[PDB]
């Protein structure tokens, strides 16, 4: 098309053509917009495009064109600036300053082209970062001088100073060397006295609200770093807290300023400063009460109505009050004349806490947590806040969330527990009266009865046992009445759920009162027959939650009972669980396993485990008979579901019983590993007949589920096993025989990554006791898994993760298995580690770097022997260059800390002389030469080729600092980050690598 003409640089630039392309991009649609976009991208990315910038700024009438031109300039200033001759740098500086002053002097352009002026200012600030103050000592005096000549220039100068302060103090850590950041911070600090005088004058002299707002915007940035005396020893505190709070144009920015004032570093022992800290708060809240809204205002309604900037203002007020009071409320607590101020400030927070806005509620909730924790421990404070705490109890109860929202529920519970300790009678009265409002129907709703139930549950354990007993009885009585009142099982189920919820949160009551606990369990068994949605789920969740807390009461013979209640539960288990879904039956069996683990007499525990497992074991025995008689019976989808649900029931009981589960695992183990083999045959058979698509069929996913649940059962047992001698003598050999060859001899798409996970647990727990087993695991899984995952970063994501977890534990527990690899296979191990480094999947990358670290430590342990010397000769420079690759390429930032640690370990090995042989091959360097001198040479050469725009001086200074700092990780990391800044630009100062705090 015609637009592509701007990309042809052999011709002079048609500005009118550029303006059309830019208009087509910003204002056009679909196909035309997409083409302009690609064209503008290639124009901008042309390394000579910056030469056209002066032409475009002078002769373009499209503000978007000039904006894109300034981006092209910014790319030059931040990256290649130091290549330019000094005369051209002053040229560019002068045309940018000229365009800014020119746009500020024209009222129409100043008003309507704010985008281009702010971009121009940011462009100037990039020049200041390069040139100032060493090649521009008069910048700040001239800016101040130029400020008295015009309101527009003064306002725009406040934008430049704000952006300069952001670039030097807020955003420098990342983007500059430590030495350059220190230089610019000291430079701004040295000239600040002048900057502040101008800012203070504008604030006193007033008039233009747009100038005043921009000055306060720059002040907000200054408050991140300036010393307290500029705030406390001038009239500025009075101005911010009186004049600038009254007008609404300045109020938003002023409140943010006063929040940062509240965070200044300040002397602790000075009564005048204390009075000044009190006074500005007093002034601010007075201006709020008289100019914005009284303490009584309904901020919930105001925020919901969302007129103008009210939402931002109420957020900022919450931020100001919480920040100030968290630091300073003790200044208001002793003086009786400051009591009204302290409670007004808290009453505003109470009103802000009623606003329906999650994130605002969280901000206020963090303050209430701070306050009520202080009232719990600090003497003579609770009585000050009695009426604040009473209102807060209602606010927290009315806002309680389900325990599923873990962080928010945790915070709410903690505040409500502290408040209950401070006044238990007030907490009880509010909860009982909110319950009365559910019963009379005035506040009745599913959300309201759920919220109240969550609140009543959250405070379990805070009352004395007696108070708790009377309260819990009153609440259950009231909810029972409420349940009976209501019509339709929708409503009855909601109240039944909440009864179940509350009872499950009060275990101390249940443990003291056996008859009640028995009735509750029997009632949960009744509800396991209710198909109304949510009820069976809740009956099962409540059963296991009560068992976790009260299990001892199920395992003893309670007086006036024939037997321990666990025997009663087991006897009736067929009848109890008949209407439950499989996953609910598994929770039920898990819960029984928790009870049975309480029985420490071996014979009685084994008998209970036997009785519990009767129904699955009889289903299992009947299936093994048929299945062994005829392998065809297993093809039936119904038989496959029964088998999976037996294995899953075993997994569920083994989860809760761990080491105690062994006799049950013993009953099924050998037939279970024969079933694993038979199922493997059927999957192989089906993929042969149907192709890879077979792996997606319900039949094959059903068979694979049996394999995965078997590996899960064995992994679950071995992870918790106590008798490791039986694991090695009875479990491991048959397990390896059933799973390893089947994994190796399946096509990639039929291999189960769960095999790798199971083997990881085996090596973790008993790796030291099965050295020949670890060798066999590696021979089976290593090359075939590596070939699945070494073509791209995406295929076989589960195999990828479990593979590097398995190499990690083998490298920790049975490093000898890697010594028994032939050299070619040990080379694939090094390749695999380096492959992990290059991953963006953070699980893989992190394991990759840890294996590399542990591998070096394993080699160091061997001391001075052939294998260790051959490791260094063959692989030292591979690890050094691979670690440098991922440090420097900008695509692996998440692993920075472990890349640094690995690189430090490698540099430290040579700097200490802990490597015994020359790292260089014969006749490549004088034969006497130390590894330290060759490492210097190899790295300088490698960095020079990879970063040819760096000087020899930059590279040699970097390597000098790096090797000196290779026992000091935090300083070494700083040197690495300094290097990552300098590779992004030309002409980085080599003295930066000498940086010392």
């Amino acid at each position: 098309g015609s637009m592509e003409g701007i990309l042809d640089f052999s011709n002079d630039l048609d500005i009118a053509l550029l303006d059309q392309v830019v208009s087509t991009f910003y204002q056009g649609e679909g196909v035309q917009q997409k083409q302009a976009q690609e064209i503008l991208t290639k124009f901008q990315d042309n390394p000579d495009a910056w030469e056209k910038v002066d032409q475009i700024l002078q002769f373009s009438t499209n503000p978007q064109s000039k904006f894109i031109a300034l981006s092209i300039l910014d790319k030059l200033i931040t990256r290649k600036w130091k290549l330019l001759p000094n005369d051209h740098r002053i040229g560019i500086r002068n045309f940018v300053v000229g365009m800014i002053i020119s746009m500020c002097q024209d009222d129409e352009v100043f008003k309507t082209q704010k985008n281009l002026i702010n971009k121009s200012d940011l462009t100037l600030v990039q020049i200041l970062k390069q040139e100032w103050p060493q090649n521009w000592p008069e910048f700040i005096p001239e800016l101040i001088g130029s400020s008295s000549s015009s309101v527009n220039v003064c306002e725009n100068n406040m934008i430049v100073l704000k952006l300069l302060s952001e670039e030097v103090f807020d955003f420098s850590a990342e983007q500059m060397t430590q030495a350059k950041a220190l230089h610019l911070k000291n430079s701004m600090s040295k000239e600040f006295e002048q900057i502040f005088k101008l800012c203070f004058q504008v604030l006193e002299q007033g008039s233009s609200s747009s100038l005043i707002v921009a000055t306060l915007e720059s002040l907000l940035r200054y408050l991140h770093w300036i010393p307290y005396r500029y705030i406390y020893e001038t009239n500025i505190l009075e101005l911010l807290s009186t004049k600038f709070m009254t007008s609404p144009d300045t109020r938003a920015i002023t409140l943010k300023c006063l929040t940062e004032v509240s965070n200044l570093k300040i002397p602790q022992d000075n009564d005048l400063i204390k009075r000044q800290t009190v006074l500005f708060f007093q002034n601010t809240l007075q201006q709020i009460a008289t100019s914005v809204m009284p303490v009584t205002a309904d901020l919930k309604a105001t925020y919901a109505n969302a007129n103008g900037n009210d939402q931002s203002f109420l957020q900022d007020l919450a931020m100001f009050l919480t920040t100030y009071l968290a630091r300073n409320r003790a200044l208001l607590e002793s003086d009786e004349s400051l009591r009204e101020l302290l409670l007004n400030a808290h009453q505003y927070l109470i009103q802000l806490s009623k606003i329906e806005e999650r994130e605002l509620f969280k901000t206020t909730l963090d303050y209430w947590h701070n306050l009520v924790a202080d009232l719990f421990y600090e003497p003579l404070k609770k009585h000050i806040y009695e009426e604040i705490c009473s209102q807060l109890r209602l606010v927290i109860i009315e806002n309680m969330v389900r325990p599923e929202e873990i962080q928010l529920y945790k915070s709410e519970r903690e505040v409500l527990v502290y408040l209950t300790h401070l006044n238990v009678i007030d907490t009880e009265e509010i909860m009982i009266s909110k319950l009365a409002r559910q019963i009379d129907g005035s506040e009745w709703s599913w959300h309201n009865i759920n919220t109240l139930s969550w609140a009543i549950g959250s405070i379990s354990g805070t009352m004395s046992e007696d108070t708790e007993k009377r309260f819990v009885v009153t609440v259950i009585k009231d909810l029972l009445g409420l349940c009976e009142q209501k019509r339709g099982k929708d409503n009855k189920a909601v109240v039944a759920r909440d009864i179940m919820y509350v009872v499950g949160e009060y275990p101390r009551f249940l443990k003291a009162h056996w008859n009640f606990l028995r009735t509750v369990i029997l009632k949960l068994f009744e509800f396991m027959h209710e198909t109304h949605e949510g009820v069976q789920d809740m009956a099962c969740d409540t059963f296991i939650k009560i068992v976790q807390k009260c299990k001892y009461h199920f395992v003893i013979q309670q007086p006036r009972e024939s037997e321990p209640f666990i025997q009663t539960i087991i006897r009736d288990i067929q009848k109890t669980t008949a209407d439950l879904q499989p996953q609910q039956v598994h929770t039920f069996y898990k819960a029984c396993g928790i009870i049975i683990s309480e029985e420490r007499s071996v014979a009685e525990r084994n008998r209970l485990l036997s009785d519990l497992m009767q129904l699955p074991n009889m289903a299992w025995d009947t299936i093994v008979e048929q299945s062994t008689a005829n392998p065809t019976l297993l093809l039936d989808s119904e038989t496959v579901k029964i088998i999976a649900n037996i294995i899953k029931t075993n997994v569920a009981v083994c989860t809760s019983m761990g080491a105690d589960f062994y006799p049950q695992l013993g009953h099924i183990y050998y037939n279970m590993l024969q079933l694993y083999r038979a199922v493997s045959s059927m999957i192989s058979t089906q993929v042969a007949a149907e192709g890879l698509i077979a792996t997606k069929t319900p039949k094959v996913r059903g068979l694979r589920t049996i394999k995965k649940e078997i590996l899960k059962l064995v992994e679950t047992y071995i992870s918790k096993a106590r008798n490791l001698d039986d694991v090695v003598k009875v479990l491991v050999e048959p397990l390896l025989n059933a799973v390893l060859e089947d994994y190796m001899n399946n096509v990639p798409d039929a291999r189960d990554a769960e095999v790798l996970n199971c083997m990881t647990t085996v090596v973790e727990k008993v790796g030291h006791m099965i050295p020949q087993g670890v060798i066999l695991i590696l021979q089976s899984v290593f090359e075939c898994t590596l070939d699945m995952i070494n073509k791209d970063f995406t295929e076989y994501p589960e195999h990828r993760v479990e593979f590097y977890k398995l190499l990690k534990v083998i490298n920790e527990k049975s490093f000898a298995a890697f010594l028994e690899l032939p050299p070619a296979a040990f080379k694939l191990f090094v390749d695999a580690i380096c492959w992990a480094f290059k991953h963006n999947n953070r699980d893989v990358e992190v394991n990759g770097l840890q294996i590399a670290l542990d591998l070096v430590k394993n080699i160091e342990r061997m001391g001075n022997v052939p294998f260790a010397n051959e490791f260094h000769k063959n692989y030292f420079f591979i690890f050094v260059s691979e670690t440098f690759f991922v440090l420097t390429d900008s695509d692996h930032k998440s692993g920075f800390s472990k890349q640094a640690l690995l690189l430090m370990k490698l540099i430290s090995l040579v700097y200490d002389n802990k490597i015994s042989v020359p790292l260089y091959q014969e006749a490549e360097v004088p034969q006497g030469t130390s590894n330290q001198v060759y490492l210097s040479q190899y790295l300088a050469n490698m960095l020079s080729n990879a970063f040819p725009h760096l000087t020899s001086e930059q590279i040699a200074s970097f390597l000098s600092a790096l090797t000196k700092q290779c026992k000091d990780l935090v300083v070494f990391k700083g040197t690495l980050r300094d290097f990552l800044v300098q590779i992004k630009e030309v002409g980085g100062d080599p003295t930066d690598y000498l940086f010392a705090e």
């Binding site: 910003y26 917009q33 997409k34 976009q37 690609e38 503008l40 991208t41 901008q44 978007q64 904006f67 894109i68 981006s71 704010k114 985008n115 702010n118 971009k119 940011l122 952006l163 952001e166 955003f171 990342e174 943010k256 929040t259 919901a304 109505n305 969302a306 939402q311 931002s312 957020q315 900022d316 931020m319 999650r358 994130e359 901000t363 873990i406 962080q407 928010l408 698509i693 997606k696 996913r701 995406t794 963006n840 953070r842 699980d843 900008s890 930032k893 998440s894």
Partner: protein
């Protein structure tokens, strides 16, 4: 029509394109194809106050595919900043994206979105996410994959841009669909395309739906 420019910014691989695509077509793209510069797509919601259209500028998060960078933000009326709750670095870069965005767009509604909350191993914990507070950003936990809160960013922005706190998404009108006809000429053609579709497996066969 009533239209608003929305810029979507954040680190590479956080879910910007996946989130937008889910809203445009309903699909979940599992593959990561890095955006080159910007992808522009119109997106219409039906509200109780009539249709609202977002001109969605879905920008590149990778520095090497950044294209015009802050040139994409010019005349944006609203924005989403996206990070990945499974990747700490992506939350660390939120202040960098916010900085570049507000220098161009000084007074606009902005949603901060922590994507991928469907993933079991969350690395950016609730307690750490406070950047939005002092910057007056709305914050949502989302998942483009589970659809957790996936309407919330656009519902919030629409309430801010229309200036109606009670604005709701409503059911778009559903016309009576036409009659079947069917062509003997395309009969054999239909069998072919149905054969391939029946023998390609539906994705995510372990999901609740």
């Amino acid at each position: 029509q009533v239209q608003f420019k929305l810029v979507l910014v954040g680190d590479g691989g956080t879910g910007k394109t996946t989130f937008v695509k889910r809203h445009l077509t309903g699909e979940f793209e599992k593959k990561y194809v890095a955006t080159l510069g910007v992808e522009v797509h119109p997106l219409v919601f039906h509200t109780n106050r009539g249709p609202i259209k977002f001109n969605v500028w879905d920008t590149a998060g990778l520095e090497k595919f950044g294209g015009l960078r802050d040139g994409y933000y010019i005349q944006a009326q609203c924005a989403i900043i996206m990070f990945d709750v499974t990747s700490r670095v992506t939350y660390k870069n939120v202040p960098n994206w916010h900085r570049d965005l507000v220098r161009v767009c000084e007074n606009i509604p902005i949603v901060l979105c922590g994507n991928k909350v469907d993933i079991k191993d969350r690395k950016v914990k609730a307690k750490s996410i406070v950047f939005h507070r002092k910057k007056n950003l709305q914050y949502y936990d989302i998942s483009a994959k589970s659809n957790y809160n996936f309407e919330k960013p656009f519902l919030w922005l629409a309430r801010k841009l229309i200036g109606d706190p009670n604005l709701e998404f409503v059911a778009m009108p559903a016309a009576a669909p036409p009659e079947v006809v069917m062509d003997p000429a395309l009969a054999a053609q239909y069998e072919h395309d149905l054969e391939v579709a029946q023998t390609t497996a539906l994705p995510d066969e372990d999901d609740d739906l």
